[PDB]
């Protein structure tokens, strides 16, 4: 089998501890090559938990979370609370597609209890204060992408996308 985990992209930094193996196989769909980001999955109906941001499953179709699909085992301290599902790679909402995928694949999702003691009133949240992406790139986009700063020298263009191509809905709870 081939397996991936979906890592979010918040303006909070607890993200780099979510995977164990960097490559594992030889197939990463979310790849960046001299134009911008590609094959980023966008889940809908989930709401972030930015204090340890974990996508709480809500019912609002307007709520969404855009993150990248990377091959690796999730933390090797999971599979009891993460959302594990295998889907046939064609019904998956991902934007900026470049190439066709392997027709079926297993996905690990950061998850949580819904916490039904607090009215889940979500909120449209962008990624601004480019210092808050400046760090997470050298945090996430280096332990996920070694290819940056050895093939990517126009890092400004991997800034000018995460600036607006990555939004979500947070819960501020």
């Amino acid at each position: 089998s081939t397996q991936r985990e979906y890592v979010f992209i918040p303006i909070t930094n607890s993200i780099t501890i979510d995977v164990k193996i960097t490559i594992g196989g030889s197939d990463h769909i979310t790849n960046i090559d001299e134009r911008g980001i590609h094959n980023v999955l966008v889940i809908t109906g989930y709401a972030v938990d930015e204090k340890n941001g974990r996508l709480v499953p809500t019912l609002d179709p307007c709520d969404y979370v855009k993150g990248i699909l990377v091959a690796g085992t999730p933390q090797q301290a999971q599979s009891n609370d993460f959302l594990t599902l295998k889907l046939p790679a064609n019904k998956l909402y991902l934007i900026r597609k470049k190439g066709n995928i392997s027709d079926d694949l297993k996905i690990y999702i950061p998850y949580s209890s819904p916490d039904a003691r607090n009215s889940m009133k979500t909120k449209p949240v962008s990624i601004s204060d480019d210092t808050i992406v400046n760090n997470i790139i050298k945090e996430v986009f280096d332990k996920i992408y070694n290819i940056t700063q050895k093939e990517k020298v126009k890092i400004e263009k991997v800034k000018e996308d995460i600036k607006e191509l990555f939004s979500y809905y947070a819960l501020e709870q």
Binding site: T44, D60, P61, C62, Y93, I95, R96, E160
Partner: protein, 285 residues
């Protein structure tokens, strides 16, 4: 705001297109194409809406409620449509080219004018401040182009001269900078001065005579003679889909428009006219 997001897209003609208009004897063509206001081909917003609505109702017969309430329910008119198309604006029409002592010998190029690019920039400006619809690079290219207005401009800097549609000699110059290609097609784009551009474009349209023949004796039936205008393959139109905030709009834009690539526009589809590719400018560039 009640127009919360916008979806700019391109309309690539896979086959020839005939979005008809009022047939009448004043245009040496019985069935002319829809003219915009400057004589350019256009697609009316109503034609786009109706065609895409029919296509979606056929292809997703379960999302029928979402489609009805985003693009306007027909049998229960009591609620405005949450979605709206702008008139499709001609962005580029293909033209036959004869190179003249140039580097890359092409046989056809994309031809635009400055009027069309002004209208495209109008559409792009009016939606750029929607906090998700950003596409800065596209309108930046359009502005670099519009600065050079007055001169027949080429984007890929190798032509310096050409004959367009076998009839129009024009001299071209670069843009002093590479200006990365608007579309990802491997064909140069020519932004022409408007006076000569109207001629090149009006010559790039297909004018066809058609007849009705009696099945028995292979003679033509009396009166069965008329002309139609088509818009060639490879022609590009530009339009925008505007959507209000309601949640069915979210699910529409989520999984109705992501699986929407080809669509039938216009009339005469039994003659194979009207197959169209929709390119969303949210993933390409």
């Amino acid at each position: 705001p009640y127009y919360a997001f916008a979806e700019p897209f391109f309309i690539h003609a896979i086959t020839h297109l005939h979005v008809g208009s009022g047939s009448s004897v004043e245009e040496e063509i019985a069935l002319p194409f829809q003219r915009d206001e400057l004589g350019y081909p256009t697609i009316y917003a109503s034609s786009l809406k109706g065609a895409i609505k029919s296509f979606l109702l056929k292809e997703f017969p379960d999302k029928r409620d979402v489609i009805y309430k985003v693009l306007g329910e027909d049998e229960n008119p009591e609620e405005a449509s949450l979605g709206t198309f702008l008139d499709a604006i001609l962005f580029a029409i293909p033209s036959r080219i004869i190179e003249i002592d140039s580097a890359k010998p092409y046989v056809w190029v994309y031809v635009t004018t400055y009027e069309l690019l002004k209208k495209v920039k109008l559409y792009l400006d009016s939606i750029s401040q929607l906090s998700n619809a950003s596409f800065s690079n596209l309108k930046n290219k359009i502005d670099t182009i519009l600065a050079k207005e007055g001169k027949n401009i080429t984007l890929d800097s190798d032509l310096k001269s050409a004959i367009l549609n076998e009839d129009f000699y024009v001299e071209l110059e670069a843009l002093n900078n590479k200006i990365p290609s608007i579309i990802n097609a491997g064909v140069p784009l020519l932004v022409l001065e408007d006076s000569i551009g109207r001629e090149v474009i009006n010559r790039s349209l297909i004018r066809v005579r058609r007849i009705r023949i009696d099945r028995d004796k292979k003679v033509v039936e009396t009166g069965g003679l008329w002309s139609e205008e088509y818009v060639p393959m490879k022609t590009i139109f530009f339009s925008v889909l505007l959507g209000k905030e309601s949640k069915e709009s979210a699910i529409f834009a989520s999984c109705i428009l992501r699986n929407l690539r080809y669509v039938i526009l216009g009339g005469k589809e039994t003659i194979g006219k009207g197959i169209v590719e929709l390119r969303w400018v949210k993933d390409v560039i």
